[PDB]
Design a binder for this molecule. Structure first.
Ligand code: QIC
Ligand code: QIC
Lengths: 259, 260
């Protein structure tokens, strides 16, 4: 593996895909419980118009069996050969389906990095500063990029707190800081957009991904080009988080806004 | 004429079109210099998918000749018979093509109200409280609804000032307060949306229309359903203000956003 990054241009290039330039990139989540479910999903996804494939490993039943994880990743790579693969174990507390100890989670991500089968890994900021920082370094030594993430499924923190978290992710070495928050009011949606603008304009030297979840926050998933979110999640069959619209509708809006 | 308005439901119903309910309504602007132009545009516009037809009277060369204005309004009504017609003389300082004295402007709108050919008129807030309140009263006596408008083509005032102007329009009797501002930064676009939300949630007992102009503010023309702007302007072939996108693309996005 080998990816490129330009601090000056605020871009990260994985498999020829230039993140942080032009229209926002579409990410879709693959969720399969077993290895054949993963194969079936990968086959169905092959035709969808997305840019990055996220494997939601927390949906995989045999996540604690090293060989099963490798077989699943290999199966995805054999079916989806030309697009960046992002390895994401999303913890239950942050919107996921299972929970691992810190040691298991870190070991899991290290094994994914070692496999050479994934282009990117997701690391949750709140896992711990030292553990996260060591794992970012480890990923980079193997030419694997890192999307560092944080989520709040109940509320939207103040704009300044959102900005400080995104800056913290940069500090720890994240290639692409990412934050997802839940609006309780319309103003909360604007708060997330305000933080996106402030971060991207005054502190960022790389791409960032932000979103206000739920139907109320969907505009944050569409207006990335103007406000500064480099990527956005769409749904193929079903949503991996509240607020995502179909990949087809997402592409339609991104194209209309790019022109 | 006769239009309905429900303060409790925050709607205004003109020609069976319920403004303030469901997806935002699309307004397009007809901009002809002469009768030929006005007629040609009306015929072409008949093919477009829009809800309200705005006649930008400030683009009309014979705007000071009563009979010409009447002939043009009649021509538009003959062609577009199923959509509300909004009569708008936009002054040069607020983005228009001509300028009239206060007297000429008030007389122009009273004559438009008298004609029975237009469903709505646009009245600029900065025309003065006395003249504006009197003219709103006049339109209502004739069953003509009023969109009261304000524009700032150089900057975006603070949200608090934006809200103050929208509340003032409401106080003056405007059926639909409307404001258009120009962003100098990305934050300015969000400031306009902040004001929209605050007005619609805390003070409005009727629909409002808001927009942040330019390509930078285009999101304010698309997300009216979630933030609280009841209508949005699209372009048929030429934009009547910076930031408008094609009517076809506008409807496409509004529909996607309205989807359950
Ligand atoms: O689109 C979102 O809001 C997501 O929550 C973003 C990120 O957390 C992904 O890992 C999820 O699968 C979806
Ligand atoms: O879409 C706009 O920004 C407009 O300026 C809104 C309103 O002022 C109309 O009268 C114009 O024709 C267009």
């Amino acid at each position: 593996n080998l990816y490129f990054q330009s601090n000056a241009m605020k871009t990260v290039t994985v498999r020829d895909l230039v993140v942080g330039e032009g229209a926002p990139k579409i990410i879709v989540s693959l969720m399969g419980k077993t290895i054949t479910d993963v194969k079936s999903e990968a086959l169905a996804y092959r035709e969808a118009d997305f840019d990055i494939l996220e494997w939601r490993v927390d949906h995989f039943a045999n996540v604690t069996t090293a060989e099963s994880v490798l077989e699943a990743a290999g199966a995805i790579r054999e079916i989806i050969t030309d697009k960046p693969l992002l390895f994401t174990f999303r913890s239950a507390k942050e919107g996921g389906e299972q929970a691992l100890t810190t040691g298991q989670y870190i070991d899991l991500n290290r094994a994914a990095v070692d496999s050479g089968l994934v282009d990117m890994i997701d690391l949750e900021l709140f896992t711990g500063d030292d553990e996260v920082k060591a794992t970012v370094g480890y990923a980079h030594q193997h030419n694997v990029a890192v999307i560092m993430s944080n989520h709040d499924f109940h509320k939207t923190p103040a704009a300044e707190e959102i900005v400080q978290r995104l800056r913290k992710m940069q500090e720890l070495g994240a290639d692409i800081p990412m934050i997802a928050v839940m609006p309780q009011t319309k103003a909360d949606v604007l708060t997330l957009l305000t933080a996106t603008v402030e971060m991207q304009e005054r502190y960022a030297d790389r791409p960032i991904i932000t979103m206000s979840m739920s139907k109320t926050g969907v505009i944050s998933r569409l207006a990335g080009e103007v406000f500064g979110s480099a990527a956005t999640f769409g749904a193929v069959k079903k949503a991996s988080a509240p607020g995502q619209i179909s990949v087809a509708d997402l592409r339609t809006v991104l194209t209309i806004l790019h022109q």
